[PDB]
Design a protein around this nucleic acid. Structure first.
Ligand SMILES: [Zn+2]
Lengths: 349, 371, 165, 266
RNA sequence: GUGAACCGGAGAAGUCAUUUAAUAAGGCCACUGUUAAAAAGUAUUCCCCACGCAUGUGGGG
């Protein structure tokens, strides 16, 4: 059972599949990817020029059957667009500014199923794995945010089960999902029902050429799917909003229990400030704590000097860095804290 | 060639700039709320300062007919001047036209000369009037700030077509953001009655708003566009640059200064000579907190020095070295106690800083160019 | 949140001498007046050893000082925005309400290190109306995650819900 | 093969792009409203730069547009956080005293500060076929565009706000299928006291790159990328099994590394 | 190489001027840290190195 259909994921921050009714400086768009637009995307991915497209490639690929499922409808967003500001414009020339207003779709995603010849689908997918040219979503200022070559080809019978095959991928966990997903699919005669129903509407996106752009109409129908029954909700990948590493804390750990022994050996079991016999070790340079402990930034200390340094660190600021003995600074405050500890701390506690 | 000045200035509790509701102006930078002083406020306070008085040769007014009458003496021409001003597409709403007009003060005598004589007709004189306002650009303040003026079209004389009446700005001034978080404060004030009565109440009760902050000021001057704005007057351009430095350093905006009097000097000035403008406002994307071991100004200067080092090491180009001077009074605040290498020269006197800036600019002396 | 409960219970168990010691240290650091440092270390250190979670040191210090100054019986269901809204509702709606609301809304702008006096004025307004309870556990939990946006959102929403009714 | 440049740039409060009403241009993403800079504004500001023109069939006609189809591709500059527009209340002043303390004009202007994410794409095959087999000039104009795009900004309202900032993170990658990383900032960046706006944006970019490297980009073909911050100001994924192949601390070194990969030219 | 490609909404600006939160006040009242104790001790000092019948001397920690 060789695969017979190809799936396209069309999702980007900004999208614009232009409609037939623009014809002027009001560049509009359609609610779904047009057939001519995705055909031009395919021809750009295969490296076929505009003149070369009109002879064989477009008539060959116009025999496929296409259906688009809506994953996210998006929001239509306009854009004021001036041309030739501070510069002349063609036709002789004129020092003038051209005003226009463009329309894009924002935060939208579509799934396109294109059933056809298995060799055609295989060659098309092979071309789409490494596109010849940069493929955008309608306009050149709309690059895709997801790989078009994402979903694998397969063999199915109807377009409804084809759009049922691919699960719906969820964003962040709180985000809700659409409950009724509209599918817009090409009308199929079947050679028995020769006359289309009255709900079938004409769209004008059957292409012939691209340099003298020519289109013909086609009958398009619109049905719907129910999520869960027809499309299973996929689960998001392992991800999170980036947070700075809050490190960890663990002394029971045997590796630190031996690093402190190495430190007490290497400073010869003596304090750095008052040179009394050492009791513990202060953990200066708290970065790389727990798993990447280097017995260099640690400094052995007695109980009174360690308590004084902890008193100084609890007061004032406190960040990943610490207060390091052997510094010529902070000596006077450490000695004052030593005096206060000696003359004020009560052992009855 | 561009001269860019970055300044750090801590202010006493005051309300130097405020919006329509009286609150001090704020902005959102780096996701955190900071205090702001609008750039036009700084530009006006420098422009209308005492230290810039020898260079003030332009007026931005709405009542030009009043100036025409006040410079024509006693001969009555005020209605006539208003009429000719209306003919060149300016309109008139009770002695003040609908638009502000920027023009050097030296050309009011010429306008008085055209308005006085009845030898010429009306409409042609209006055209002549345009030719004086389109060429009254030889002022230091017009050269610095820049002027654009577009007159009306529904009441023009059809024979008064205008020349080019714009001047590109030779000075870019940023909005003075704060290096730390915003801390707005409310001062609950009362106003008492000098005459005793029955009750103990006072005349008025209200609340004002004030805040104290450390501001980061950024200015940029384009020397080539400056000397083009004054038509090759390099001497006058250098005089403007020196007077502008003195006024910017030694003047503060006069907002609510009779009740707060926050006349604080800057604690650090960095003057750089470049070819492309760079702003060090991203030094304080992380707001400046306070540690007991230091203070606000020293921490701000250290953060600025760290970001300047980052910028210089990450955007070094052997084709365009950058020469900068650091100024602090009597070298109180150096450029951080970590590098001692981002300042090509350390200056402790403001006058010496201005003289060195002028000597780098063109080799002139200050006392030569002051007149 | 059991560590916060143990912290608050140990705070209520305090005698009057160390309460006065903490009262004398309002607005101060942790590096001076050694008896305060020793008392705070005795209060806070056993929480980390047994309980894996523990309130932040700055939050715990602020809570201890505020409890020393403004001794309140800990009771579940007496969060600060709800009591503040109940106080604000019985006010003159033209002059006093904007002032007191501005003093309340000043709080949701700073960090932990500068909330002492803006919280002390709030506790003074509470003590003016003779309160007898305050949810120290909920206030500590909210103050711990003060940088999360839904925390401030729920703080303001609870205040508005208590104000409106 | 395709070259892709991703850019993170915080801007001081300004109005770098306007519309018919003066407001900064915005867009919609992640369920919220983000600030935006239109792609044609960035392309024009890159193209007409005097330092760019004085630096380098014409190289600008080969890279940009005028069937001559450009290999350049500039996307709309979305923002990694919720937009925050603001109104500034300006009052004009009169130097001539009158009967009252009138202004002369009263109004409101708009400004906004944002940390924009920029995406760029250069098609090497179209570029080399545009210049008829030439390669050294193609690498030269690629480097020229890299320096220009790293050191340029739009001129909108810059006489009043002066937002002459510099980028704080650049990521240059080589791969075949074009994918942008705007999906990283689907969740808007919310600041914390332990990080910056730029730091969190760079970290979220690193997280998204790590997740997609663990996913679609299998061992079919390795992906070569270079990460740059000034003087190693910000790391993209500290260690993390070397998510970025290199860490660079000067623009010239990144330009040389990219040139030496693409052709070995210097 | 897509109703596509080539494609700035830009230029100008101070929210200013005026002001006391004033007037009254006690944290008071009651309290034993008490009960018991030698700084003494010879039967192998915790370790290096020169000689000996001594039933140990010398130097080092
Ligand atoms: Zn010690």
């Amino acid at each position: 059972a060789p695969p017979n259909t190809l799936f396209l994921r069309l999702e980007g921050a900004l999208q614009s599949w232009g409609s037939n009714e623009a014809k002027f400086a009001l560049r509009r768009t359609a609610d779904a990817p047009t057939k001519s637009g995705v055909l031009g995307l395919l021809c750009a991915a295969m490296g076929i020029g505009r003149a070369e497209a009109a002879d064989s490639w477009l008539p060959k690929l116009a025999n496929l059957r296409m259906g688009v499922r809506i994953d996210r409808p998006g929001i239509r967003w306009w854009d004021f667009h001036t041309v030739g500001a501070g510069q002349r414009m063609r036709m002789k020339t004129r020092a003038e500014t051209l005003l226009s207003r463009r329309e894009y779709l924002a935060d939208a995603s579509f799934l396109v199923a294109l059933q056809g010849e298995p060799e055609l689908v295989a060659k098309l997918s092979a071309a789409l794995a490494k596109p010849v040219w940069a493929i955008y979503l309608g306009r050149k200022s709309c690059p895709p945010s997801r790989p078009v070559c994402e979903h694998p080809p397969g063999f199915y019978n109807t377009l409804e089960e084809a759009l049922s095959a691919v699960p719906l991928q969820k964003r962040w966990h709180n985000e809700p999902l659409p409950q009724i997903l509209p599918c817009v699919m090409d009308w199929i005669p079947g050679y028995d029902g020769e006359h289309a129903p009255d709900d079938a509407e004409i769209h004008y996106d059957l292409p012939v050429s691209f340099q003298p752009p020519r289109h013909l109409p086609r009958f398009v129908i619109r049905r719907e799917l129910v999520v869960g029954e027809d499309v299973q909700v996929s689960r998001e990948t392992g991800t999170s909003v980036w947070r700075p590493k809050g490190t960890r804390a663990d002394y029971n750990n045997s590796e630190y229990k031996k690093v402190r022994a190495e430190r007490l050996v290497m400073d010869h079991a003596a304090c750095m400030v008052c040179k009394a016999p050492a009791t513990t070790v202060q953990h200066v340079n708290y970065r790389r704590a727990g798993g990447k402990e280097i017995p260099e930034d640690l400094r052995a200390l007695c109980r009174l000097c360690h308590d004084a340094c902890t008193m100084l660190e609890y007061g004032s600021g406190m960040t990943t860095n610490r207060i390091d003995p052997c510094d010529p600074i902070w000596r006077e405050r450490i000695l004052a804290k030593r005096k206060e500890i000696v003359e004020f701390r009560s052992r009855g506690q | 060639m561009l001269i860019e000045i970055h300044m750090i200035q801590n202010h006493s509790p005051a309300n130097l700039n405020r919006d329509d509701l009286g609150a001090p102006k704020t902005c959102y930078f780096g996701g955190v709320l900071r205090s702001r002083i609008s750039s036009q406020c700084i530009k006006r306070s420098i422009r209308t300062s005492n230290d810039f008085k020898a260079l003030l040769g332009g007026v931005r007014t709405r009542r030009l007919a009043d100036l025409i009458q006040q410079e024509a003496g006693e001969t009555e021409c005020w209605k006539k001047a208003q009429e000719i001003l209306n003919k060149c597409g300016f309109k008139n709403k009770d002695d003040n036209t609908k638009m502000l007009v920027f023009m050097s003060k030296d050309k009011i005598k010429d306008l008085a000369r055209i308005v006085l004589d009845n030898s010429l007709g009306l409409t042609e004189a209006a055209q002549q009037v345009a030719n004086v306002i389109a060429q009254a650009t030889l002022a230091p303040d017009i050269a610095l700030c820049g002027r654009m003026l577009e007159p009306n079209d529904k009441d023009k004389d059809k024979k008064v077509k205008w020349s080019n009446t714009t001047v590109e700005a030779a000075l870019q001034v940023a909005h003075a953001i704060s290096t730390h978080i915003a801390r707005p404060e409310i001062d609950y004030f009362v106003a008492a009655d000098d005459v005793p009565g029955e009750d103990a109440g006072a005349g008025h009760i209200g609340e004002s708003m004030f805040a104290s902050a450390c501001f980061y000021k950024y200015f940029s001057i384009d020397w080539e566009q400056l000397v083009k704005n004054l038509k090759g007057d390099t001497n006058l351009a250098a005089h403007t640059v020196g007077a502008f430095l003195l006024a910017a350093a030694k003047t503060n905006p006069s907002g609510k200064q009779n009740s707060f009097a926050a006349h604080n000097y800057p604690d650090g000035i960095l003057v750089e000579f470049k070819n492309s403008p760079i702003s060090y406002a991203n030094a304080f994307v992380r707001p400046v907190s306070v540690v007991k071991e230091s203070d606000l100004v020293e921490q701000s200067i250290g953060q600025l020095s760290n970001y300047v080092n980052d910028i210089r090491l990450g955007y070094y180009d052997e084709q365009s070295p950058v020469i900068g001077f650091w100024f602090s009074p009597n070298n109180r605040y150096p450029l951080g106690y970590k590098h001692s290498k981002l300042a090509s020269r350390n200056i402790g006197n403001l006058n010496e800083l201005v003289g060195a800036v002028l000597d780098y600019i063109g080799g002139f002396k200050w006392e030569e160019v002051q007149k | 949140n059991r560590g916060t409960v143990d912290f608050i219970a140990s705070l209520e168990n305090l005698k009057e001498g160390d309460l006065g010691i903490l009262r004398k240290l309002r607005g101060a650091r942790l590096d001076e007046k050694l008896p305060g440092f020793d008392l705070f270390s005795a209060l806070w250190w056993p929480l980390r050893q047994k309980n894996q979670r523990a309130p932040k040191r700055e939050v715990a210090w602020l809570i201890a000082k505020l409890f020393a100054e403004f001794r309140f019986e800990q009771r579940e269901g007496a969060t600060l925005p709800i009591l503040m809204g109940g106080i604000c509702r019985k006010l003159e709606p033209k002059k006093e309400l904007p002032r007191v609301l501005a003093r309340f809304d000043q709080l949701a702008s700073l960090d932990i290190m500068q909330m002492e006096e803006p919280l002390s004025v709030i506790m003074g307004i509470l003590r003016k109306h003779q309160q007898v309870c305050l949810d120290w556990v909920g206030l500590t939990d909210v103050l711990s995650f003060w940088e999360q946006e839904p925390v401030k959102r729920e703080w303001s929403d609870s205040f508005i819900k208590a104000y409106k009714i």
